[PDB]
């Protein structure tokens, strides 16, 4: 068999297998950026009410699905990789879970260019000065080449403090867990 080039991040499931196949196809020929473009364009195309309703009916012959998808991939002059991918999905019958596929690819592309995702949780909004110093400190966690991809969020449950997720690392500065730890210590 061929030596498919391993994508940076590994995904699993049918979505992950299709995404890995597409990533290794595009990586050879160095067509990642454009391929992502056509993928995020079929993302909009497939949401079209007519196509969305037509592709979920199981009572239209599969060949009809493939013919319609070839029609809708020739009009946009999609790269041969994306047209082949969509024909493949229609043949195998997995296009019902295309959004999981393309989404996975997006993830598999972020990890390529270093967008190590993060996530900050707090009980209130954050002042842009405080948020900016936060970003500046969080940047110190990464390596060279990587760039932070922050994502603010709000939860009321945690009283104060803060919660930070940096890829896999996780620091719970929240006051909820501090209170719980103190309560356990002063019970046990």
């Amino acid at each position: 068999f061929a030596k498919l080039v391993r994508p940076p991040v590994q995904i699993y499931g049918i979505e992950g297998r299709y995404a890995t196949a597409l990533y290794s196809a595009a990586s050879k020929q160095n067509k990642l950026e454009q391929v992502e473009k056509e993928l995020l364009r079929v993302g909009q195309i497939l949401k079209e009410p007519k196509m969305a309703a037509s592709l979920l009916n199981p009572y239209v012959k599969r060949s009809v699905k493939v013919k319609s998808l070839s029609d809708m991939t020739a009009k946009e002059k999609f790269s041969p990789l994306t047209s082949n991918l969509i024909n493949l999905l229609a043949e195998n019958g997995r296009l019902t879970n295309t959004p999981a596929v393309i989404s996975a690819f997006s993830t598999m592309m972020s990890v390529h260019r270093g967008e190590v995702p993060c996530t900050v949780t707090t009980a209130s909004a954050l002042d842009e000065a405080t948020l900016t110093e936060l970003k500046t400190v969080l940047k110190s966690f990464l390596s060279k080449g990587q760039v932070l991809k922050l994502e603010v969020k709000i939860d009321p449950s945690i009283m104060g403090g803060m919660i930070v997720r940096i890829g896999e690392k996780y620091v719970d500065m929240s006051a909820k867990t501090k209170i719980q730890k103190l309560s356990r210590a002063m019970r046990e």
Partner: protein
């Protein structure tokens, strides 16, 4: 629902439009080899149960034709196959060589010679999986197949074209029955009555090679190898070989059957072909059934034993007798596979493992041994003597757990039962069998001691073979015991008895 071929290595080929460069019609690539079963991607034109040839000389047999891959079984050890190996068709349903060249060779399940005497120079090949004769080709079993074992030839007669079944616990003497049968035909094969020559085939399934080597030595010793084939799929051999060995042997015999010749084939054991089949099926992810045996383990043996037939004279008059050997566990003849085969055959020899210690060897458990063909496949002289002998044993068998009349009955029964013992690899001509049975059933041993009949048999046989061979020749050629022959036998028996003490 994830197809086997829904992998990255394949979908990548599909995506970047490179699949057209490779042949996916008469060729395939191993997706996943493991435990002796390959999945192959490609071979869109491979026939079901066709043979295929891997890229290292190993062969396989494409059993499963799934929508996207092919479940192939390797006729060997998969140590040499690797994911990505190229599998290329052979074009033909799996078939084995046949002919008279195999005679006297220790061939292997696929027809390769493992005796080291050089290649088999065969000419024709037969598919292993062929249909058995129909209703019309056959006729009723009429000729006798002389086993050479007093008990079998007397009370469990076996005809030519009949499927017996030697069933009994482990180490009770089943292979011994088979080898007595093979060695006996030596007298017929060394002769000119071309219509009585019988060609033997021994299929050794899942038996250690030391056993098969000792058996082949035993056959060469009696020079019973010039007319014997030995299809040896021993324990070390992959499951598919042990599953195919019976069919290779059966086709080697269908050859002699389809040419007016008479063959005997001895599968030993069939309970190990069933185990090999179960392993194969479970490794192809086929759902199990009883005791994990695949759902269709009856058809497996029925389609094998149904090929033992007796062709009419418009089809050559050939014949193929089958003697499957089954092994019960604790006399539990009511198990799954023993019960499967007991209803497929017509007749059955019950080797009991306590008749085997109480003294009776061969352990044949008369009364439970039947031959649905019956007296129809017996010699006239043996018919005559066995008619009385079977009845007398049948009476003695219900008063055995002990007057004057019944005491005489018990004495006679014990005399007969001591007349049915025998050694090994020493079968007897039918004439001698009828001679001794007649000696014992008329009453010319009602006084001699029980422990002395074992030796009187041998002494009387030596005497007749050395003094009155003309009588035996007359009985054998005439087939029946003529009145003058009966009187000659009476004279001889009384004379030897008087001067034996």
């Amino acid at each position: 629902k994830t197809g086997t071929a829904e992998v990255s290595s394949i979908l990548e080929e599909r995506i970047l439009g490179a699949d057209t460069s490779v042949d996916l019609e008469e060729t395939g690539r191993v997706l996943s080899i493991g435990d002796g079963i390959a999945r192959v991607h490609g071979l869109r034109n491979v026939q079901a149960e066709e043979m295929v040839e891997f890229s290292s000389g190993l062969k396989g047999m494409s059993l499963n034709l799934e929508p996207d891959n092919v479940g192939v079984v390797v006729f060997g050890n998969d140590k040499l196959i690797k994911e990505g190996d190229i599998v290329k068709r052979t074009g033909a349903i799996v078939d084995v060589p046949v002919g008279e060249e195999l005679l006297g060779r220790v061939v292997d399940a696929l027809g390769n010679a493992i005796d080291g005497k050089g290649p088999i120079g065969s000419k024709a090949r037969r598919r292993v999986g062929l249909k058995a004769p129909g209703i019309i080709p056959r006729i009723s079993v009429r000729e006798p197949m002389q086993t050479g074992i007093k008990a079998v030839d007397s009370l469990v007669p076996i005809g030519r074209g009949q499927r017996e079944l030697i069933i009994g616990d482990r180490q009770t003497g089943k292979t011994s029955i088979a080898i007595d049968t093979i060695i006996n035909q030596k007298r017929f094969n060394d002769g000119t009555d071309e219509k009585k020559k019988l060609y033997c085939i021994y299929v050794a399934i899942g038996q250690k090679r030391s056993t098969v080597a000792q058996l082949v030595k035993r056959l060469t010793d009696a020079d019973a190898m010039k007319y014997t084939i030995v299809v040896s799929a021993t324990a070390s051999d992959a499951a598919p070989l042990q599953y195919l060995a019976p069919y290779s042997g059966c086709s080697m015999g269908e050859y002699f059957r389809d040419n007016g010749k008479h063959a005997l084939i001895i599968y030993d054991d069939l309970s190990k072909q069933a185990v090999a089949y179960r392993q194969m099926s479970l490794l192809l992810r086929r759902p199990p059934g009883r005791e994990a045996y695949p759902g269709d383990v009856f058809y497996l043996h029925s389609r094998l034993l149904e090929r033992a037939a007796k062709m009419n004279d418009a089809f050559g008059g050939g014949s193929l007798t089958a003697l499957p050997v089954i092994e019960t566990q604790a006399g539990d003849v009511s198990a799954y596979i023993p019960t499967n085969v007991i209803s497929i055959t017509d007749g059955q020899i019950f080797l009991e493992t306590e008749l085997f210690y109480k003294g009776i060897r061969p352990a044949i458990n008369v009364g439970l041994s039947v031959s649905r063909v019956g007296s129809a496949a017996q010699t006239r002289a043996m018919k005559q003597v066995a008619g009385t002998m079977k009845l007398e044993l049948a009476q003695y068998r219900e008063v055995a757990a002990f007057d004057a009349a019944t005491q005489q009955l018990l004495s006679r029964g014990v005399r007969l039962t001591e007349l049915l013992k025998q050694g090994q690899y020493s079968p007897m001509a039918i004439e001698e069998q009828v001679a001794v049975i007649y000696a014992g059933v008329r009453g010319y041993l009602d006084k001699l001691e029980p422990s002395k009949i074992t030796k009187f048999e041998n002494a009387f046989l030596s005497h007749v073979i050395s003094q009155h061979q003309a009588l035996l020749g007359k009985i054998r050629t005439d087939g029946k015991i003529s009145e003058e022959s009966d009187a000659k036998l009476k004279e001889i028996v009384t004379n030897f008895l008087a001067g034996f003490e």
